[PDB]
């Protein structure tokens, strides 16, 4: 039965290799399609603004639906409500970052913890840098580095997210399974901001760092990780 069992193991290994090849091709084509979608959205915003300006009107862009929140103050002397909301945002340490889906409830929570955080609207590059350099998964309650696509697939494949690109797409374009994809990510442990901060104790619009800076959160992220 030796020849037959050799044939069995060769057939099993070959089927496994073909399955891996098919999945890799699928991942490649999904990433290509995501690239097409990203450039379509980026050009669409410009085109809409251009036609409004040609007509002499104003094109108001959609209010951003994704935010990046970074806790900037430490854990000493925190009021109970601010402490609770920071725990619900999973910011239990200074220079911890989390993606937040923006709506009325989340925005009001951000207003509650406004002095303790700096938040803004990340762009595609910021999402890519954050997921690729500091992306860790919460797999079996453990902080596991996203070194393989199988780690994402085994935890989120039931939602259709099977690769780094799928995770980045779901985070960037806030999809149906954004809650699952975001909670799968361990909160980002960012370094100290290289080059320093302006003033962590005051709001951004008064020369400090706390509060909502609209899109300067990308500059903060570049210096931060």
């Amino acid at each position: 039965n030796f020849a037959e069992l050799k044939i069995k193991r060769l057939r099993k290994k070959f089927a496994q290799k073909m399955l891996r090849k098919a999945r890799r091709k699928l991942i490649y084509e999904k990433a290509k399609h995501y690239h097409k979608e990203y450039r379509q959205m980026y050009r669409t915003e410009i085109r809409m603004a251009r036609m409004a300006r040609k007509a002499g009107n104003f094109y108001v862009p959609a209010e951003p639906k994704l935010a990046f929140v970074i806790r900037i103050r430490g854990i000493n002397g925190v009021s109970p409500k601010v402490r609770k909301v920071l725990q619900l945002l999973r910011l239990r340490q200074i220079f911890n970052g989390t993606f937040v889906k923006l709506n009325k409830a989340s925005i009001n929570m951000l207003r509650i913890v406004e002095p303790y955080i700096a938040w803004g609207y990340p762009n595609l590059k910021s999402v890519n840098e954050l997921i690729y350099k500091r992306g860790y998964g919460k797999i079996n309650k453990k902080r596991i580095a996203l070194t393989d696509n199988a780690l994402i697939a085994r935890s989120l494949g039931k939602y259709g997210i099977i690769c780094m690109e799928d995770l980045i797409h779901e985070i960037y374009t806030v999809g149906k399974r954004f809650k699952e994809a975001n909670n799968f990510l361990w909160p980002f442990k960012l370094s100290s901001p290289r080059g320093g901060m302006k003033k962590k104790t005051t709001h951004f619009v008064e020369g400090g760092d706390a509060g909502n800076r609209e899109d300067q959160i990308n500059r903060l992220i570049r210096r931060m990780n």
Binding site: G74, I75, N76, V78, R83, L86, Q87, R92, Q93, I94
Partner: protein, 63 residues
């Protein structure tokens, strides 16, 4: 510093029998192996009952 609380970190539970009965320890070895190497939750329940104390293992009447 991290804003967590450490008062409930250590779960209080039996990981082994407090008894020194060698026969009990041998059959705890057997059911440790069975609970590890089988998916039968019955073996897990039996192992955790073997860990238990006498008040947590009350006698069962014939009736």
């Amino acid at each position: 510093g991290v804003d967590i609380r450490h008062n409930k970190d250590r779960k209080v539970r039996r990981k082994e029998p407090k008894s020194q009965d060698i026969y009990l320890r041998l059959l705890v070895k057997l059911y440790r192996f069975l609970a590890r190497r089988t998916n039968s939750t019955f073996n897990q329940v039996v192992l955790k009952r073997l860990f238990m104390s006498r008040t947590n293992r009350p006698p069962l009447s014939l009736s």
